[PDB]
Amino acid sequence: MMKTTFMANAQNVDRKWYVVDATDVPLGRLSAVVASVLRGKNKPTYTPHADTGDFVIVVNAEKIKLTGKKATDKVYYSHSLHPGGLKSVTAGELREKNAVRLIEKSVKGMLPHNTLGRAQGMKLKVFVGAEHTHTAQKPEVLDITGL
């Protein structure tokens, strides 16, 4: 009666690799489903300690389909612990410079904020204008839609 559950993963994990891209795709609608795959939530094998952390690959990450004037009023912030620690990276700015944390900080907002969330969330694969590198392994392109 007692052990009708099953992990089937918590030692025997999988490892798969996915080139996931669209050049312009909107940020939220990409973000929560690449969050779903970096969980492996879409994989039918969930465990709260699954470690189905997908090799979530992005290249050519120049553009969000940017609704409204969000490149003028998105503006980010930060706070260094020195008092009066406002330091702001702003809206359209550093998109053209380095659109990396332009994504994965928002996917930190996606993820379950814990050691596993920072595990695969700090195991993203991020490229902004590239053909990336190390196709020694086998990468696979995932979808287009927000499903």
């Binding site: 009708t4 559950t5 099953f6 089937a8 939530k41 879409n42 994989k43 039918p44 094998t45 969930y46 465990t47 709260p48 499903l147």
Partner: protein, 117 residues
């Protein structure tokens, strides 16, 4: 009649401490923080006698919408097809078919396809 029952009193002390053993550090080297420490633990073990119910069911429905979503199927219209479906409204054994069941899983999914149909 100035009597004590001293060893009996310490046997209540001994009884609750031996039943209290295991937690962090100083606690069994003391008395009273350990007293809640079993006690709080089966307060919400009493809640988890309802909440591993209500979270293993989240594992159930979550993994079954994971495989349904692997067939591109959403849980609400799937279950809606399960009430549309047969004498089966069987739930969580139908969650347990996450192992290796294209026959049971995708075919019962097709039963739901002819239930929405």
């Amino acid at each position: 009649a100035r009597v004590k029952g001293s060893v009996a009193t310490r046997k209540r002390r001994k009884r609750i401490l031996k039943l209290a053993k295991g937690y962090y550090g100083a606690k069994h080297r003391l008395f009273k923080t350990a007293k809640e420490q079993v006690m709080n633990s089966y307060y919400y073990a009493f809640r988890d006698r309802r909440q591993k119910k209500r979270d293993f069911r989240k594992l159930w429905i979550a993994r079954i919408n994971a495989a349904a979503r692997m067939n591109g199927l959403s849980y609400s219209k799937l279950m809606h097809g399960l009430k549309l479906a047969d004498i089966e409204v069987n739930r969580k054994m139908l969650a347990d078919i996450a192992i290796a069941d294209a026959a049971a899983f995708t075919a019962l999914a097709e039963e739901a396809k002819k239930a929405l149909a």
